[PDB]
Amino acid sequence: QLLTLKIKYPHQLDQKVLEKQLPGSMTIQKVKGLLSRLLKVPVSDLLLSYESPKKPGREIELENDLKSLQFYSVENGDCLLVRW
Ligand SMILES: [Pr+3]
Ligand SMILES: [Pr+3]
Ligand SMILES: [Pr+3]
């Protein structure tokens, strides 16, 4: 299953968020790898969380690099929040 996710950085307006299509089976390590190469920020520095429109405003940390997006129940249309 492919997830279409919004990608938000802290300084961005909600109106200017990016999107990416990612497999749900992708590990958090590999999502950080992708973001690291895009942003030129080290993998070790990235902090990822997500939010669902089902529970507006609640952030869930994507903490365990070995686990997948699916493990955390990230769904189509959710928003990945990226900090460093
Ligand atoms: Pr908000
Ligand atoms: Pr927010
Ligand atoms: Pr700082």
From Swiss-Prot:
The root-end lineage is: Eukaryota, Metazoa, Chordata, Craniata, Vertebrata
Gene name of the encoded protein: TBCE
Quaternary organization: Supercomplex made of cofactors A to E. Cofactors A and D function by capturing and stabilizing tubulin in a quasi-native conformation. Cofactor E binds to the cofactor D-tubulin complex; interaction with cofactor C then causes the release of tubulin polypeptides that are committed to the native state. Cofactors B and E can form a heterodimer which binds to alpha-tubulin and enhances their ability to dissociate tubulin heterodimers. Interacts with TBCD.
Q: Where in the cell is it found?
A: Cytoplasm; Cytoplasm, Cytoskeleton
Where exactly are the transmembrane stretches of this chain? none
Family to which this protein belongs: Belongs to the TBCE family.
Provide the positions where the record notes the PTM N6-acetyllysine: 20
Functionally, this protein is described as follows: Tubulin-folding protein; involved in the second step of the tubulin folding pathway and in the regulation of tubulin heterodimer dissociation. Required for correct organization of microtubule cytoskeleton and mitotic splindle, and maintenance of the neuronal microtubule network.
In the UniProt entry, the disease listed is: Hypoparathyroidism-retardation-dysmorphism syndrome: An autosomal recessive multisystem disorder characterized by hypoparathyroidism, intrauterine and postnatal growth retardation, psychomotor retardation, epilepsy, microcephaly, and facial dysmorphism.
In this chain, where does the modification Phosphoserine occur?
A: 52
Its domain of life?
A: Eukaryota
Report what the protein is called.
Tubulin-specific chaperone E
